[PDB]
Design a protein around this ligand. Structure first.
Ligand code: HIS
Ligand code: HIS
Ligand code: 4JO
Ligand code: 4JO
Lengths: 414, 414
């Protein structure tokens, strides 16, 4: 035999598993359309340039890359956001803004699974927190559409500006801010002592760290205000954020967590994460504001951006745990059963009529006995079995039977 | 700047181009559902083993492949059919047959464009030509659904068994039959003299070639019969085929062409190609019967298979040529315009109501003047603009205006 298992770390999607994936993707699509985003795509294979940010990131560290025969540096994309930036940047003044773009790219890592699908939603050209508000509400919407509630999940929200103020006041050149987020992002996962030591390696001093941990463990926006001011950008922003989410009707879904930073270098302002309220699973989704990526890529004018990624794995685990992923059995409207081979030409004409009317229909393709054909109809989840027999055809009729046996005229079938 | 162009031979799909791709994919999906096929997927990255057939094929020759860091032979799939076989074979006795599986994989080649999307439709477990009939009718259906007619296109049909009989009677061991098809497949593309010389290289003699070209240029099924018999498999098959397609209502779409072989090694019986009736474009789609692939992959019992691939490029060129690809402008049902920032909380509640009712709606995310907001609504193709102003909100109303301005109650919006 040839190897029937897929390549290391990659999933097969036979029809059963594919119905589960469609169930999910359908929601990502429907949500995106509900929120007015526009679909886009770009190649899974990008130039390796695009992902060299040098902030010790997990996503750049764990990169599926290789060299073409021509000697060019390429890589299977680990995330979408850089591809988006390339596209947006490719369009100059010609891109109407604001722009709301979404996609469901397969993304790759080398190491544990090595690929996944990630819904991406991004808003371009909106300075205000109204964008983050929309994005966060989109993630909730999607989760709600999958049957989840604010009892089951929520979205932790923060701003990196708070910590930016604190880092800056510590005398630390602003270049250090990206690696500091990537290290502090590991605060939950790994112990307190082993995070400290990373910051010491990147040249930071002890009193400047104290203020980091303290601010990380601040429990409220009012507590942040005490430390930084009530008309600091972040406080006004976050109050506006929570006020807007409150008004849209999703206030029970969102909450402030000062420990939330995310592990990506490019986030400048608000950042967020979906999580289950039982503490069982990793982040359901993740995003934030990244107002300087496109300047970094060489845009002559800075372009404000915000968005998120919502993976295809954790959501499923969670939906299984909550018994919200029932087997989706296959369905087709009609199965057309010729009484025998002499009725095939006639069964085809029937098949053609049914399909013309927008119905999904099979016709039995092999030579088989009526009861075996009917069993088959049940097995593939036919709503209806349509028997084409010679005695009924002579009368201009067929025999129909609902699975979930009467004589019926041809016109009246549809 | 970073490089804004995609990697060599790969396409970007910004929203405009993506709407064109959805237009097409929608039809592939809808057709598949109409014909009762089940979606599946597998990884774009496969083991290179899977494609070593050694019949001098163009698809194996032009393979996008590389080695992982672990030293394993892998490759971006050039086609789907081998992946399908792996899947089908992975399921043993447990796969209910017949099975009808479809997918729209991106496929890859190294060399001219290096990737494309290819609708795949395959039927597994059906001995009879009813499968090829269904497949061919599916391809037509799809093309018809894109606005094309039998005046514009058709599907040339043949059987490799005819040539098999002729090759065998020439004393040529059956091993030679796969390379002979791959060479003769180049009969249209390259000149008569340069095809002859390929067959001479693979050890064939002169009189055996004469019979090949003559049979290739036979113009009718009746002419084939003269040469091989009226109850040769192929003649009975093809008559059954054309009779069945005739009965389904698509007889004007299909026709016999003895020169049709396809360039793939695995086809055993009936084979077909879509083409434009003006002689301008390459093959729109291509397929056939491959009853021994799964035996070749190590199946303990032979499993009959048939199917086709339908690329995303030629169809588009053709649809453009026939003016059947109009710009699909963006649409959204509602754009919600707060009179000003003090009306935002209220505009959100409105936004929430609209979306709850299944409508697609935006809300203006930046701070902007009403007329600029309304311009924007037009630019993104809003069907309707919904103005949330303080005088109307106090009355429990909004101002609605159709783009393709009245006071309206909130309940009555939906
Ligand atoms: N690229 C981010 C998600 C994101 C989309 N837009 C902004 N952020 C991630 O992989 O987590
Ligand atoms: N794999 C074939 C198409 C096909 C699908 N099933 C059978 N044949 C191609 O690339 O042309
Ligand atoms: C979980 C994950 N994250 C990435 N960034 C890329 C692939 C995979 Br799998
Ligand atoms: C036209 C084409 N054919 C393949 N087999 C693979 C990629 C591409 Br592009």
């Amino acid at each position: 035999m040839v190897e029937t298992e897929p390549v290391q770390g990659c999933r097969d999607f036979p029809p059963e598993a594919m119905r589960c994936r469609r169930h999910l993707f359908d929601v990502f699509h429907a949500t995106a359309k509900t929120f007015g985003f526009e679909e886009y795509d770009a190649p899974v294979l990008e130039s390796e340039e695009l992902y060299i940010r040098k902030a010790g990131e997990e996503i750049t560290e764990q990169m599926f890359n290789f060299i073409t025969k021509g000697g060019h540096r390429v890589a299977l994309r680990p995330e979408m956001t850089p591809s988006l930036a390339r596209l947006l940047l490719g369009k100059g003044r010609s891109l109407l803004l604001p722009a709301k773009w979404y996609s469901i790219p397969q993304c790759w890592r080398y190491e544990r699974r090595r690929e996944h699908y990630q819904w991406n939603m991004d808003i371009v050209g909106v300075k205000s927190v109204s964008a983050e508000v929309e994005l966060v509400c989109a993630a909730c919407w999607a989760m709600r559409s999958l049957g989840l509630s604010s009892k089951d999940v929520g979205i932790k929200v923060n701003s990196r500006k708070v910590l930016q103020t604190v880092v800056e006041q510590a005398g630390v050149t602003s270049d250090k801010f990206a690696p500091v987020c990537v290290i502090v992002d590991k605060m939950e996962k790994i112990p307190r002592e082993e995070v400290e030591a990373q910051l010491a390696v990147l040249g930071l001093e002890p009193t400047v760290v104290d203020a980091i941990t303290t601010t990380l463990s601040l429990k409220s926006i009012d507590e942040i205000a005490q430390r930084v001011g009530e008309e600091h950008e972040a406080v006004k922003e976050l109050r506006q954020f929570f006020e807007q989410v409150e008004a849209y009707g999703y206030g029970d879904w969102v909450l402030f967590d000062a420990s939330v930073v995310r592990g990506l270098a490019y986030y400048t302002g608000i950042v967020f994460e979906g999580f289950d309220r039982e503490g069982k699973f990793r982040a359901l989704c993740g995003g934030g504001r990244y107002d300087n990526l496109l300047t970094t890529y060489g845009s002559p004018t800075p372009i404000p951006c915000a968005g998120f990624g919502f993976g295809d794995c954790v959501i499923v685990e969670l939906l299984q745990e909550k018994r919200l992923l029932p087997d989706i059995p296959h369905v087709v409207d009609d199965v057309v059963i010729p009484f025998d081979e002499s009725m095939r030409p006639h069964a085809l004409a029937v098949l053609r009529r049914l399909r013309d009317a927008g119905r999904s229909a099979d016709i039995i393709l092999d030579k088989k006995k009526v009861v075996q054909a009917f069993n088959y109809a049940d097995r593939v989840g036919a709503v209806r079995a349509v028997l084409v027999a010679p005695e009924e055809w002579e009368r201009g009729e067929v025999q129909v039977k609902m699975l979930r046996g009467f004589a019926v005229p041809l016109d009246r079938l549809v």
